[PDB]
Design a protein around this ligand. Structure first.
Ligand SMILES: [Zn+2]
Lengths: 125, 210, 96, 577, 170
């Protein structure tokens, strides 16, 4: 194996109940080595897939090319750039900007959004 | 714990209480004063940790100030929190030896009944309380703390006379004050404080304990 | 480019903000020193400053040379608007 | 309203309204604040050789016309043995004073406030008598020496025919007296000021008159006067303007907000700190300082952890995380019986190698710390330090024998995962690995290439300063930081006052509180005369316990009700009286 | 020749150390006696702990894991060729011993960076203009505060940190 293997075991909150649609909680079967998820208000139970039920502090979420919705490119008050070549389309006109968050914490790194209809593609530098 | 660093702590509190005894005027060997941790490690045989005397054999007698009022005794209990029972057994040992004054250095906390009972036995025989943390250093060597001299009752009589004051008119100091506790001075007595000055250069003040 | 390399006792944002402030202060001080020198003996303004009557070197700097970096609460103008100080500027403009 | 009742009394001890003594002579010296002026202390002279060259009156005089220069008199006294012993009696005393003065001003500052400017008066004598600066004089050195002894006796500020009073006199004019004698030395007069005998006689008469005039007047409302004199520069400059300096800064409140914080005897200062000094190799090596700092820095496991995970794995020997499989090979002999007892709920922690390095901490110390804190119930195992991924593997064990569902298990069937979160909640928030108590994530590592510290004495006798490392800390635990190894237990100090009192005791507060007030005033740039500040701190400590100048402080004083009603609480105090 | 033991636990720990030394068969291209050396390692550890304690077991186990490293076989080779005696091996020469490139470099450069987080702490005010009236150094600081004023107008106050000396433009 390798340390290159990404860290996404499946955080997973919802796959809630199938009958009354309320939230499922883990609970043990000491007899078969199986995790089960049960609704607290009904007799419904089902085995879990991953043995993971909680993680905390990826600390490095890089949220660098996610949540940043492509429609941001229409904003006139953001700086258009003559700096060329979107990395997908053969056209310049990337709109760029810092952080745009409170969880960024100290970033000075630029984020670039191509603005022509052929991409919507986004990328850091 | 079970580590040599603990020895350093035992060594260091031993150094401080010896300086304190010395400063109360009690006769102590300068060689004891100079005794380092590596010397101590052989001279008391702080063994290899596990195996003996946590704080029962370190227990020491101190013998008298230039005026022979005879010995002072310094005790180091073992348990983290000391109960009245151990104090009572200790009291039996000091009485049978007929000690004159006891200093008790406790590991951590203090039973409130023990402090109370310690209070109540005071009129009969006198008895001191130090937490070990306060003895890990020697406050009298701090850059802020001036030279304190306890005055003899007669010298105070002369002081009140020469200024024509009354004891009440003087500046005051708590009995429970760390420096007051360090000399182990009792209520009603006066301490003479000598300070460096930015104008006279040297300034002398007095404080009544109360 | 993410190559600034933070100073050992600050974050990357704080290092940048310290560093531009050092340069813009350094700039005002050079031009300020330059005007006091360029002035002659007859400047009545120099006669009021030098006697110790009113004003100061920095006053001379401000009328003739350059006023410099305004301040509030100990740092440069805040982003009153979303990532801008006035509507007239481009977003996220950290220049002078 | 606090100080108002304090004034000089006719025996000169400054007392308040109920007649308690504040100081024994006003401002520790008997001198009023109107006629004192800044003067230099020649005697803090650097090299031992230069001082000896400059001050010693020569006897190994040149066989040439030597001495007929400067004096026509030395032809008279080149043979006297007694005059040689007496000047040697003077110089040894000067050299002894010189040693005392170094102890008084550890900072090696030679600027002190004194009455009667002796250089300008001496310069005034030369001007009036028209003394040629390059001719032989008729002045006699023994006349100067005895004249200076005579003049010291004449300069009495409070009567002393009593040995205690005689001693109170000797120390209360010590700084002026060494200043007088070091400036008016026989060689000083001879080699430099060239004064004549009547000129010297007038000079004694002048120093005598101005000094006696200088003394403070009994009756002066020095308490009222001192309060306004401190009050006035507090009106001046800086509400809360920031001064960029080193790495530090969001440090020590500056100005009026600090005056309010200090004077109220705040239990919760806005920015409490300790300036910690280092010793041995740790006072000059960065890496050693790093090690002590690490022990001091209050780090909690939450600060250290990269990541956490909870896994469902009853039997390790079939681990859900296939990569963990090697530790099972590694840990089959780790209490092999109670693998039949350990809960099927697993906690996994991932640690950062850079962050773990900075604290220089080991995995075994953590396992041992957590095991010791929670107890043998919390079964911990860990990884090889050389792995590229740092991991801690945690299960929970029980007491075996007693748990057989005797009644219903006194736990009320708490979910064990959920209990494992409570372990994770507490394990992170509580565990104080290496770092002990609250000095917080905030440390500062400062090089004192800055100010006037770390200076000493040398074989040359000069005040060659050191440049050394110190630690500024935002924190309060002054007591523990003193107890730690390699931290200098002499110079380590705090800007906090409530804590200084608990640890060091009331006299140390008197000094530190004067220093903190001195520090805010110097920042704001304006100077305040020392007497005024000494009197305020002395007014606040006199009762024994700190008297914040607020209604819960000074209005608890045993002063009369009618004074105390005019302060703040008014009606309540009159009702209580 | 190394002392045998009658304890089952110590004997098992020995074969585990021997098993750890057998990794990669490196011992073959040298032909050393890894079982005897392991017994000497165990004995040498025992000379320090003198107990079957967890701390002994952990120390043996951490020796075992460090010998099992696939990123640094050259360490094991160094032990196997007798360049590192067992009494030496009993105590680490580095945190998790990683000498022989890769991790030591990485640990060292990491030691550079965490020491780098102290280096200048951060200092200065930056003007370096006026020259001190005491220690005659030109490294100095200035303060600018309260404007207009009544009788103490805005003046430039200059302080020499370098010896706490303070003056005004004056
Ligand atoms: Zn200097």
């Amino acid at each position: 194996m390798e340390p290159d293997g990404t860290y996404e075991p499946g955080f997973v909150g919802i796959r809630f109940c199938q009958e009354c649609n309320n939230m499922l909680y883990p609970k043990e079967d000491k007899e078969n080595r199986i995790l089960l998820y049960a609704c607290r208000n009904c007799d419904y139970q089902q085995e879990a897939d991953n043995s993971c039920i909680y993680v905390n502090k990826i600390t490095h979420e890089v949220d660098e090319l996610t949540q940043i919705i492509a429609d941001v490119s229409q904003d006139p008050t953001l700086p258009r750039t003559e700096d060329h070549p979107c990395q997908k389309c053969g056209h310049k006109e990337a709109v760029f900007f810092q952080s745009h968050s409170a969880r960024a914490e100290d970033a000075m790194r630029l984020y670039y959004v191509c603005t022509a209809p052929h991409c919507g593609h986004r990328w850091t530098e | 714990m079970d580590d040599e660093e603990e020895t350093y702590r035992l060594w260091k509190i031993r150094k401080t209480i010896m300086q304190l005894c010395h400063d109360r005027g009690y006769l102590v060997t300068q060689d004891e004063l100079d005794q380092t941790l590596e010397e101590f490690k052989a001279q008391s045989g702080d063994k290899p940790s596990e195996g003996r005397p946590r704080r029962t054999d370190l227990t020491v007698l101190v013998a008298h100030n230039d005026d022979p009022t005879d010995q002072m005794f310094v005790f180091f209990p073992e348990e983290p929190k000391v109960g009245i029972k151990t104090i009572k057994v200790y009291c039996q040992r000091m009485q049978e030896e007929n000690i004159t004054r006891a200093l008790i250095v406790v590991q951590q906390g203090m039973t409130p009944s023990a402090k109370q009972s310690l209070v109540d036995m005071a009129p009969k025989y006198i008895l001191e309380q130090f937490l070990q943390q306060e003895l890990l250093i020697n406050i009298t060597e701090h850059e802020l703390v001036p030279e304190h001299v306890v005055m003899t009752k007669e010298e105070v009589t002369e002081l009140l006379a020469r200024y024509k004051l009354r004891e009440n008119q003087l500046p005051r100091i708590q009995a429970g004050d760390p420096v007051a506790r360090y000399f182990g001075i009792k209520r009603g007595q006066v301490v003479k404080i000598i300070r460096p000055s930015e104008t006279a250069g040297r300034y002398i003040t007095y404080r009544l304990v109360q | 480019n993410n190559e600034l390399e933070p100073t050992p006792g600050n974050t990357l944002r704080q290092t940048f903000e310290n560093q531009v402030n050092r340069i813009l202060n350094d700039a005002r001080d050079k031009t300020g020193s330059s005007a006091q020198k360029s002035l002659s003996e007859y400047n009545n303004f120099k006669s009021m400053v030098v006697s110790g009557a009113k004003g100061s070197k920095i006053n001379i700097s401000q009328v003739i040379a350059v006023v410099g970096q305004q301040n509030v609460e100990g740092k440069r103008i805040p982003f009153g608007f979303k990532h801008r100080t006035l509507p007239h500027f481009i977003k996220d403009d950290y220049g002078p | 309203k606090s100080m108002e009742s304090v004034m000089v009394k006719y025996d000169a001890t400054v007392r308040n309204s109920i007649n308690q003594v504040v100081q024994l002579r006003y401002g520790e010296d008997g001198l009023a604040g109107e006629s004192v002026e800044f003067q230099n202390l020649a005697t803090l002279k650097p090299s031992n050789k230069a001082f000896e060259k400059k001050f010693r009156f020569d006897y190994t005089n040149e066989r040439a016309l030597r001495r007929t220069l400067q004096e026509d008199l030395v032809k008279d006294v080149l043979s006297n043995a007694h005059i040689q012993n007496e000047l040697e009696r003077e110089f040894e005393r000067m050299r002894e004073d010189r040693e005392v003065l170094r102890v008084i001003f550890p900072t090696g500052d030679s600027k002190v406030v004194l009455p009667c400017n002796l250089l300008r008066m001496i310069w005034n004598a030369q001007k009036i008598f028209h003394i040629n600066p390059r001719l032989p004089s008729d002045l006699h050195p023994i006349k100067v020496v005895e004249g200076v002894k005579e003049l010291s006796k004449k300069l009495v500020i409070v009567n002393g025919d009593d040995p205690l009073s005689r001693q109170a006199q000797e120390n209360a004019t010590l700084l002026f007296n060494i200043h007088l004698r070091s400036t008016l030395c026989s060689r000083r007069m001879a080699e430099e000021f060239r004064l004549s005998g009547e000129a010297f006689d007038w000079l004694l008469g002048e120093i005598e008159s101005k000094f006696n005039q200088a003394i403070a007047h009994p009756g002066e409302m020095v308490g009222a006067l001192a309060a306004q004199s401190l009050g006035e520069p507090a009106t001046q400059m800086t509400l809360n303007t920031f001064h960029y300096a080193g790495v530090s800064a969001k440090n020590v409140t500056l100005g009026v907000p600090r005056l309010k914080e200090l004077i109220n005897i705040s239990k919760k200062p806005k920015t409490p700190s300790l300036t910690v000094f280092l010793l041995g190799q740790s006072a000059r090596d960065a890496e050693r300082a790093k090690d002590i700092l690490c022990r001091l820095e209050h780090t909690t496991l939450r600060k250290v952890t990269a990541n956490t995970a909870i896994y469902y794995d009853p039997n390790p020997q079939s681990t859900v995380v296939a990569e963990d499989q090697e530790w099972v090979n590694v840990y089959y002999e780790m209490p092999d019986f109670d693998v039949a007892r350990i809960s099927p709920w697993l906690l996994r922690v991932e640690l950062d190698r850079k962050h773990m390095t900075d604290r220089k901490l080991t995995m075994e110390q953590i396992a041992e710390k957590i095991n010791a804190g929670f107890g043998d119930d919390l079964n911990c195992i860990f990884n090889d330090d050389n792995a590229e991924k740092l991991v801690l593997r945690i299960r929970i064990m029980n007491s075996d024998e007693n748990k057989m569902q005797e009644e219903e298990e006194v736990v009320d069937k708490m979910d064990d995962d959920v209990f494992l979160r409570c372990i994770e909640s507490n394990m992170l928030t509580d565990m104080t690995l290496q770092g002990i108590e609250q000095i917080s994530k905030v440390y500062m590592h400062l090089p004192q290439t800055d100010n006037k510290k770390k200076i000493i004495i040398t074989e040359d006798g000069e005040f060659k300063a050191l440049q050394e490392w110190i630690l500024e800390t935002d924190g309060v635990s002054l007591m523990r930081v003193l107890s730690e190894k390699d931290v200098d237990p002499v110079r380590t100090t705090s800007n906090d006052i409530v804590e200084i009192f608990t640890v060091l005791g009331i006299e140390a507060v008197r000094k530190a509180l004067e220093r903190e007030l001195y520090h805010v005033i110097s920042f704001d740039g304006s100077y305040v005369n020392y007497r005024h500040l000494a009197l305020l701190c002395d007014t606040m400590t006199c009762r024994g316990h700190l008297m914040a100048i607020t209604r819960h402080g000074v209005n608890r004083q045993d002063t009369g009700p009618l004074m105390k009603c005019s302060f703040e609480e008014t009606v309540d105090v009159l009702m209580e009286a | 020749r190394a002392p045998s033991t009658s304890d089952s636990v110590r004997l098992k720990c020995r074969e585990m150390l021997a098993a750890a030394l057998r990794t990669g068969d490196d011992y073959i291209a040298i032909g050393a006696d890894e079982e005897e050396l392991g017994s000497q390692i165990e004995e040498a550890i025992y000379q320090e702990i003198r107990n079957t304690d967890m701390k002994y077991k952990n120390r043996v186990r951490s020796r075992i894991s460090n010998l099992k490293d696939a990123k640094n076989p050259n360490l094991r080779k160094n032990v196997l060729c007798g360049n590192i005696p067992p009494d030496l091996f009993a105590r680490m020469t580095a945190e998790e011993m990683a000498s022989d490139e890769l991790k030591e470099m990485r640990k060292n450069l990491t030691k550079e960076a965490i020491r780098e987080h102290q280096m200048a702490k951060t200092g200065g005010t930056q003007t370096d203009l006026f020259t001190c009236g005491k220690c005659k150094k030109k490294n100095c600081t200035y303060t600018q505060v309260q404007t207009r004023s009544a009788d103490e107008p805005m003046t430039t106050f200059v302080v020499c940190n370098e010896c706490g000396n303070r003056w005004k433009f004056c």
